[PDB]
Design an enzyme around this catalytic site. Structure first.
Site, short mmCIF file in Angstrom:
data_model
loop_
_atom_site.label_atom_id
_atom_site.label_comp_id
_atom_site.label_asym_id
_atom_site.label_seq_id
_atom_site.Cartn_x
_atom_site.Cartn_y
_atom_site.Cartn_z
N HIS A 243 14.18 -10.50 67.06
CA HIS A 243 13.69 -11.86 67.27
C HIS A 243 12.58 -12.22 66.28
N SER B 57 17.66 -12.98 63.16
CA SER B 57 17.40 -13.02 64.60
C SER B 57 18.64 -12.56 65.36
N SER C 168 15.71 -17.71 70.35
CA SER C 168 14.59 -16.80 70.13
C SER C 168 13.72 -17.26 68.97
N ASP D 22 17.77 -4.27 66.86
CA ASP D 22 17.60 -4.30 68.31
C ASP D 22 18.88 -4.82 68.95
N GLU E 96 14.87 -0.80 68.66
CA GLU E 96 13.75 -1.29 69.47
C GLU E 96 14.03 -1.24 70.97
N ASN F 142 11.78 3.03 71.17
CA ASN F 142 11.57 2.54 72.53
C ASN F 142 10.96 3.60 73.45
N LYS G 184 5.18 1.47 73.56
CA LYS G 184 6.21 0.44 73.50
C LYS G 184 6.73 0.06 74.88
N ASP H 208 5.14 -3.22 76.13
CA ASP H 208 5.96 -4.39 75.86
C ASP H 208 6.87 -4.74 77.03
N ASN H 209 7.59 -3.75 77.57
CA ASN H 209 8.53 -4.03 78.66
C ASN H 209 7.81 -4.49 79.92
N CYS I 86 6.60 -9.22 79.63
CA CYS I 86 7.32 -10.19 80.44
C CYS I 86 6.40 -10.89 81.44
N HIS J 212 19.10 -8.96 77.88
CA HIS J 212 19.48 -9.24 76.49
C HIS J 212 20.80 -9.98 76.39
N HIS K 33 6.06 -13.06 73.97
CA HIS K 33 4.93 -12.20 74.25
C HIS K 33 3.75 -12.54 73.34
N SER L 11 3.64 -2.33 69.82
CA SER L 11 5.07 -2.13 69.66
C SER L 11 5.50 -2.09 68.20
N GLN M 101 6.84 1.19 65.19
CA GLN M 101 7.98 0.97 64.31
C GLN M 101 7.63 1.31 62.87
N1 NAD Z 1 13.34 -9.77 76.81
C1 NAD Z 1 12.62 -8.72 76.52
O1 NAD Z 1 11.50 -8.80 76.03
C2 NAD Z 1 13.20 -7.37 76.79
C3 NAD Z 1 12.46 -6.22 76.56
C4 NAD Z 1 12.99 -4.98 76.86
C5 NAD Z 1 14.25 -4.90 77.38
N2 NAD Z 1 14.97 -6.02 77.60
C6 NAD Z 1 16.27 -5.92 78.20
O2 NAD Z 1 16.12 -5.61 79.55
C7 NAD Z 1 17.29 -4.91 80.00
C8 NAD Z 1 16.87 -3.70 80.79
O3 NAD Z 1 15.59 -3.26 80.33
P1 NAD Z 1 14.87 -2.06 81.08
O4 NAD Z 1 14.22 -1.19 80.08
O5 NAD Z 1 14.06 -2.62 82.18
O6 NAD Z 1 16.09 -1.25 81.70
P2 NAD Z 1 16.15 -0.07 82.77
O7 NAD Z 1 17.30 0.80 82.39
O8 NAD Z 1 14.90 0.70 82.70
O9 NAD Z 1 16.42 -0.64 84.24
C9 NAD Z 1 17.54 -1.45 84.66
C10 NAD Z 1 17.63 -1.28 86.15
O10 NAD Z 1 18.79 -1.96 86.66
C11 NAD Z 1 19.21 -1.23 87.78
N3 NAD Z 1 20.56 -1.65 88.16
C12 NAD Z 1 21.73 -1.41 87.50
N4 NAD Z 1 22.77 -2.02 88.03
C13 NAD Z 1 22.24 -2.69 89.11
C14 NAD Z 1 22.80 -3.57 90.05
N5 NAD Z 1 24.09 -3.92 90.06
N6 NAD Z 1 21.99 -4.10 90.98
C15 NAD Z 1 20.70 -3.76 90.98
N7 NAD Z 1 20.05 -2.95 90.14
C16 NAD Z 1 20.88 -2.46 89.22
C17 NAD Z 1 19.09 0.22 87.34
O11 NAD Z 1 19.07 1.05 88.49
C18 NAD Z 1 17.74 0.18 86.63
O12 NAD Z 1 16.67 0.50 87.52
C19 NAD Z 1 18.12 -4.63 78.76
O13 NAD Z 1 19.18 -5.58 78.68
C20 NAD Z 1 17.11 -4.80 77.63
O14 NAD Z 1 17.69 -5.23 76.40
C21 NAD Z 1 14.48 -7.24 77.31
N1 ADN Z 2 7.50 -12.31 70.48
C1 ADN Z 2 8.43 -11.41 70.17
N2 ADN Z 2 8.72 -11.21 68.87
C2 ADN Z 2 9.65 -10.31 68.55
N3 ADN Z 2 10.37 -9.53 69.36
C3 ADN Z 2 10.07 -9.75 70.64
C4 ADN Z 2 9.13 -10.65 71.12
N4 ADN Z 2 9.08 -10.61 72.50
C5 ADN Z 2 9.98 -9.71 72.82
N5 ADN Z 2 10.61 -9.14 71.74
C6 ADN Z 2 11.62 -8.09 71.78
O1 ADN Z 2 12.81 -8.62 72.29
C7 ADN Z 2 13.64 -7.50 72.64
C8 ADN Z 2 14.66 -7.91 73.66
O2 ADN Z 2 14.43 -9.22 74.16
C9 ADN Z 2 12.67 -6.39 73.08
O3 ADN Z 2 12.96 -5.17 72.41
C10 ADN Z 2 11.28 -6.94 72.71
O4 ADN Z 2 10.50 -5.98 72.00
K K Z 3 4.09 -15.57 71.56
#
Ligand code: NAD
Ligand code: ADN
Ligand code: K
Ligand code: NAD
Ligand code: NAD
Ligand code: NAD
Ligand code: ADN
Ligand code: K
Lengths: 453, 448, 455, 453
Positions: free
Chosen positions: A45, A68, A73, A123, A148, A173, A178, A182-183, A187, A307, A366, A374, A378
């Site tokens: 992103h 991206s 994003s 990523d 990532e 990761n 990280k 970040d996780n 959020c 994702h 974020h 994070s 890298q």
């Molecule tokens: N947007 C962001 O900034 C960002 C950052 C990191 C990760 N992510 C995304 O988040 C997702 C997961 O991240 P994570 O590290 O928290 O994963 P994780 O593996 O640590 O946890 C996912 C959870 O889902 C649970 N699960 C699976 N199937 C299920 C169901 N049917 N009902 C209920 N629970 C269920 C699992 O038991 C687990 O606890 C991925 O798609 C990853 O790409 C997004």
């Molecule tokens: N502001 C941001 N810039 C770049 N990457 C990001 C940002 N926020 C979240 N991400 C990344 O987006 C990925 C999945 O959404 C994660 O690995 C997380 O590190």
């Molecule tokens: K921001």
């Protein structure tokens, strides 16, 4: 549009003061210039937090090509700032699926010839798949892979078992700064901010449902509890459900007896008739099925934080129910109709980000101070694989160098210290009488590799 | 009389054990298990050690950890006819008399197969003094940290050909005690000892480990402005994220020992110091004599060398209000008039909270502690050690930690106790993540 | 006025908004057929917004006729007024912003062609209508039943006017009501402050150090917003009683001045406390609560925000000639503390301000969310029905000297609004048992508490 | 074993630094001796912090007699400290109510003759009704009565409405240091301590019900939420029930549709089969009925923080359900068995604080530092009334002098300033220019009389 170049420059200046750990490399490692001739490509992103990464990489002498991974994003002021260096680069937000591929395909070509890449930044693992399947000759001088997020890592793991994987990979990761920075805390800042920007409702007194209790789900649930909602969680893994029970939430199954038979009769329609908001965190296939989605309350909000958009069944709603748009990333979806809807109807749903990444979709993302930890991981990982020169050592040595790798703990602590000192905090020093007592030097790792923190 | 009553309750707030029992009843997968048990008798283990022997199993028990032995559990057992005392003997000469009348009842030794040792002190004699019995063993279960170091290094040194399993590294064991156990217990105890107002004042807690993470919330949720001190940068990173302030007792953190090294300005503005680490001399004597007036001193880190109590005793005098609370005066070795300004206060003895104010954690926290070990025992007895040939064992040798599958089965009953429900996967869905409907859902690298 | 065809967008904009005002809709539905407001003639002057249009459309549904305008100069949303005008109610709110129009709009509101209108009710938004009614058209005062005002500044003017005898018809104020005060003040800023901060700077809010000046009823809401995000915050105040609450809520009370006194010299500033603060929030109405000497001691790259009304609560005059000003985004600014004659972009010692002493919540936000504005407008609908039943105007000239009085909103009508707001959250309140009520000494219908109960 | 009075005095002697305002009362009025041996009678559940007030009154030169108000709050060890100071006391924990009422009348009559009295302290109006229906020739000598609690104000207002109340009183609940300080934070600090001290259960992840959202309700709810519980709120007043939604709580009703009509079918059996802990905080005659606890889940724990025992139909639990005492303050209530039982049953009930009050029935109770302001105003009200001596006023003017009044502003502001300085805060002095502009004197009343604080 080109106006946003100046706006991004001011934001970056304030951003630099907000990233003490990453900026330290510009003063310490700018002397010996570790990266020389390391031609690499990247894909994550694009926010203002990404711009400084490219800035420092260009400053140290490396060159990159970038893209991206998600449609909603891109930040148009952050992308324009990077283009202000004279690079012809195209990136934006809000494009069709076909246009999304057209940008990646432009990245790895220069008017007819593929890039002479040596390493990658990927990523999710999308760009990973194209280079293995579509261009077998790209991976011939590759030293490693930097990943990532979690979804990519699972893409890397199975490709080792089939033997399609040909180069070693590093999983950033897994570093403590990280996933526990970040996780979890990324959020929490962004979720409720993104929600209130779209609907502009009062969150106090309402009811919400969050599916999954992973590292993302913890922060999401806190981001909603700190505003005043009533939050409930669902889970398949009993450990995460135990954590949810001991953090002050209620755990429940959206299907009767927790068994998804497939028929409408197995849905606990009583409880779903009291829920106003849905958030999906699992990142799995079809955790919000069409039969479930037709039993929710009227005027209910649906959003996704994982994702990929396989979490909610948007395919069914496009073939049966009607859609109308209020504003970007906001939709109204009437029920019991395909041809049209009454102008004064009250039976409808509202969808955010079209089931895609919502906090980057409806908001900025974020904060700059969180991505600092994070990104230094890298950058350190990029070095730790470049000097090894995996493209040059003989194949007699390749058969033993191909193994799982991850950065050591000292390189993580050297970033954690510079992050802590950014807040104005202070870290004490152990006297020799105490350091020898615990078996740890005055400078070194204080914890083993098995410690879970 | 009353010692027979708490058993019904004890059965009532342990959902996991009774759930497992009613799941496995009728089938009885294990019959006549030869566990020789010696872990300290507690209020929770009463049923599975007296009911079975009352029905006719007739299996004796003992207590290895004498320091943790409680007379309440022994009195509860004493209502039966089993010749067991568990008295506070505290003398070896009279103890040897009790031992000899237990191993043999009818004149022959009993065919013990496993020993329940959580101390690791008597395990290196007897059974290894003559290797005749060592050819019929199954496994070993130890819980104490750094006590299994003896087993580990006399395994690497090459005097053992038996794999060992560690119960401590279990996931459910970590969160229940290290993190969630302290958050409930600290805030109650600190107020119970003194009855003060935890709002508006300022506190200082040392370290940001699991115990520190649990303690900081127990103080901050009441309105105390908390500060944290830590030598590990990662723990300090987590401290800054949760919304706390990180400080140092020493000028720039460098401890030179001279008086010009202590930042005395902060210490006069701080109202509380508490220690959560396990290091030595973390509460230095130089800053001990420069605190604010009438501060409270607390310690939970299992080590009595954290606070410089020796300097304090040789320089300052104590007042014994009761054997459970101690007051200390900084005026001098003696001679307080009636009540002065220069004095401090200590909780119980400065060493541990477990001196008698409170014991452990509520039974719901300790439900998983005894649940993991019984599943470890049931796993070992499912297969017979003598039936596995020794050839292919030497052809494939590896050391493996406890499988994640056994731990998940613990939490399922415990979440079901609170009234929750866990969703089952579908065959199509479970193939996306690469794990079956029942298999372990996480790799071993994943940190909960 | 622009396009009349664009009122369709405003129609569905109202329609979607209507879902979040359960109380207004409940009162609209319950009173159908009974027609409390049959024959009433109402004048309104509240600022025109989306929820304002909801107020006009709910007043006219019960059988009353209304004429509307805007007391304010800058506050007008053109979309909402178009929908009501197309619905068929005369509206005169637009963004003229010219001095010539201000004199023209006041007389044109009441007089159309030379024949006076038969007004019976007035809604004022500051007291402008009250002044012109009693001062410039006294001939029609005999037919007006009363006035309702929702702002305290007009309440003070109204009360001072009462003594002079210029007031002739009664009025009711609603500011002191619970469902007005608590929703307008505490919940209003608690929801909005941390949202407005994070849209402006996008800073990681958790872990930094903030200062709040004041702990009033707005101050508590502003201070609770920050502590839930992850800050550490400090409180400064001059009132012993309200300062004592902050100590109990878990704060620390401090002062920017040494020993608390301000002698006006440079030696009186506490630099040991201002050197670690990066956010200062002023929640007062007093003048110069932040002096120029505090602005010379703040830590570099700090954030300042004012939530009052005036450009004089903080010393912007000292920064108007000594420092330089630069703009970052639509409504955030940089102030460089190195000098005046020029400045490089890589400075460290600058300062960041939000909207400079002006409104922060109209510049780039929509202000309070639509659910709180439900409680402000639903209190005023019940007062008009209450005044209509009294029938002051038609009374004989003798009895007109006994009815005239100033009274606050009755407690029972206050409880009516709160009942239909709980049912908007799905809440089900309990109904008293006749056996239970007599034990307490209150009616089953209510109210339940004394008139001086501190809520 | 009276000899615990030494320990009681030793515990009492170290609580002086928690009450700065009460100390400053001596540092201001020790040189005047205002009471000059006036006779003060009272009734309140006594503690160490009330013992501080008693010893202060004795040190001011007066002599008092004192009786208990609640069965469980005797605190023999704490009361022995004052009992050793020559003041006879009559109390015993767990005594039969007949002995308690025989003890109450014991102190009224001394050697066959009514003792002298000038002021009276009261709690709950129990002694006031006795005084009005026994020896009515006693009221004329008394100069004033000082009483507290919200219920006592209602009793006094009803007495005034009947027109038979003499010897006017002073309302202390109106003052801020008593209403918004004692009522809110006392429960928030004491309830969790008492319940966790008595039961030792885990208070995270379970469901509880709290009835009423007044000041005490607004306080007791926060302590449960901060411990990790999920709690529900119900009330009859719309105004106070609205605040629960804005605070983030959820509103239900024990009766279907909110209409109670007395039939067994009118209750809602759904939510009652989930709640495990009930804290009732209304101080009424009947908030729960006999049939509410028939739908209750097994092994719930009962609690009462109100004023009387009317709020639980203990008469209903006495006729059909037998009682057997096993452990002090915690004993069993069977649900279906009478005059006999089976060997094992899962359907018994757990009781805390039988009829009487929690906290100061199972724990130490309200803490010292909180109750500084309450006792400070308690003493200062007596001083204020003494500054308006009676038996010197004109006979014709006495009729029109009697009126209802409240404590003025500056006294409460000084008490609050005393409490502020005890925590280390510093209060800004208003400049002379800001006195002219706003329109308030530098040290006078800052708030109008109608401020809601
Ligand atoms: N947007 C962001 O900034 C960002 C950052 C990191 C990760 N992510 C995304 O988040 C997702 C997961 O991240 P994570 O590290 O928290 O994963 P994780 O593996 O640590 O946890 C996912 C959870 O889902 C649970 N699960 C699976 N199937 C299920 C169901 N049917 N009902 C209920 N629970 C269920 C699992 O038991 C687990 O606890 C991925 O798609 C990853 O790409 C997004
Ligand atoms: N502001 C941001 N810039 C770049 N990457 C990001 C940002 N926020 C979240 N991400 C990344 O987006 C990925 C999945 O959404 C994660 O690995 C997380 O590190
Ligand atoms: K921001
Ligand atoms: N309470 C219990 O029931 C119980 C049971 C077993 C063990 N313990 C004890 O708990 C202790 C700590 O628990 P944990 O495992 O959560 O902690 P931890 O092992 O995770 O780390 C303790 C922290 O102390 C810090 N520290 C060390 N020296 C320091 C110094 N001089 N100044 C500041 N900080 C310093 C370390 O960096 C570390 O972050 C252990 O030493 C163990 O003996 C407690
Ligand atoms: N912006 C908004 O959303 C909004 C909402 C409601 C009201 N307001 C207006 O803004 C103000 C908000 O105040 P309020 O309604 O809570 O009233 P308030 O009277 O209760 O607040 C006054 C507070 O300021 C403190 N104070 C006064 N002078 C001080 C000084 N020199 N230094 C420190 N503390 C000082 C007082 O001790 C008190 O705590 C009012 O003028 C109100 O009309 C704004
Ligand atoms: N330690 C103690 O036990 C202790 C300490 C302080 C105060 N109190 C008690 O606190 C109470 C006063 O509380 P407050 O100051 O908030 O007064 P309050 O009158 O404002 O609170 C009582 C609440 O009960 C509600 N209510 C009335 N009848 C109801 C019913 N049947 N069901 C549900 N809700 C109902 C009212 O709406 C009100 O909100 C007194 O009864 C007093 O005994 C007890
Ligand atoms: N331990 C205590 N000592 C003195 N007053 C108390 C104590 N606990 C509660 N109170 C007061 O008792 C009254 C009702 O219990 C309230 O006014 C409350 O503030
Ligand atoms: K006490």
């Amino acid at each position: 549009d080109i106006t946003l170049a100046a706006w991004g420059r001011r934001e970056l200046i304030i951003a630099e003061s907000e990233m003490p750990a990453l900026m330290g490399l510009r003063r310490k490692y700018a002397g010996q210039q570790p990266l020389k001739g390391a031609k690499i490509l990247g894909c994550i992103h694009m926010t203002i937090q990404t711009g400084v990464l490219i800035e420092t990489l260009v400053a140290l002498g490396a060159e990159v090509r970038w893209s991206s991974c998600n449609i909603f994003s891109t930040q148009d002021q952050a992308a324009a700032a990077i283009a202000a260096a004279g690079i012809p680069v195209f990136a934006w937000k809000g494009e069709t699926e076909e246009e999304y591929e057209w940008c990646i395909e432009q990245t790895i070509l220069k008017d007819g010839q593929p890039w002479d890449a040596n390493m990658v930044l990927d990523d999710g693992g999308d760009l990973t798949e194209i280079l293995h399947k579509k261009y077998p000759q790209m991976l011939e001088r590759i030293h490693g892979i930097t990943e990532e997020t979690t979804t990519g890592v699972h893409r890397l793991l199975d490709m080792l078992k089939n033997g399609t994987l040909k180069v070693p990979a590093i999983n950033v990761n897994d570093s403590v700064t990280k996933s526990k920075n970040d996780n979890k805390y990324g959020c929490r800042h962004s979720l409720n901010d993104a929600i209130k920007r779209g609907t502009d409702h009062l969150l106090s007194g309402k009811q919400a449902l969050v599916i999954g209790y992973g590292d993302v789900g913890k922060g999401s649930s806190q981001s909603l509890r700190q505003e005043g909602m009533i939050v409930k969680v669902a889970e398949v893994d009993p450990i995460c459900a135990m954590q949810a029970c001991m953090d002050g939430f209620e755990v429940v199954s959206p299907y009767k007896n927790g068994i998804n038979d497939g028929t409408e009769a197995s849905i606990d329609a009583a409880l779903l008739g009291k829920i106003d908001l849905i958030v999906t965190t699992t990142g799995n296939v079809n955790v919000c099925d069409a039969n479930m989605l037709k039993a929710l309350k009227k005027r209910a909000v649906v959003c996704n934080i994982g994702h990929f958009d396989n979490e909610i069944d948007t395919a069914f709603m496009r073939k049966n129910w009607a859609w109308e748009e209020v504003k970007p990333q906001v939709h109204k979806i009437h029920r019991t109709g395909k041809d049209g809807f009454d102008a004064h109807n009250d039976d409808y749903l509202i969808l955010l980000a079209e089931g895609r990444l919502v906090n980057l979709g409806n908001a900025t993302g974020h904060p700059s101070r969180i991505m600092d930890g994070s990104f230094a991981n890298q950058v350190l990982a990029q070095i730790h694989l470049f000097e090894q020169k995996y493209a040059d050592l003989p194949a007699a040595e390749k058969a033993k160098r191909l193994s799982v790798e991850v950065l050591p703990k000292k390189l993580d602590e050297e970033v954690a210290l510079e992050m802590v000192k950014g807040f104005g905090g202070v870290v004490t020093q152990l006297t020799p009488k105490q350091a020898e007592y615990i078996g740890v030097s005055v400078e070194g790792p204080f914890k083993p590799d098995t410690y879970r923190y």
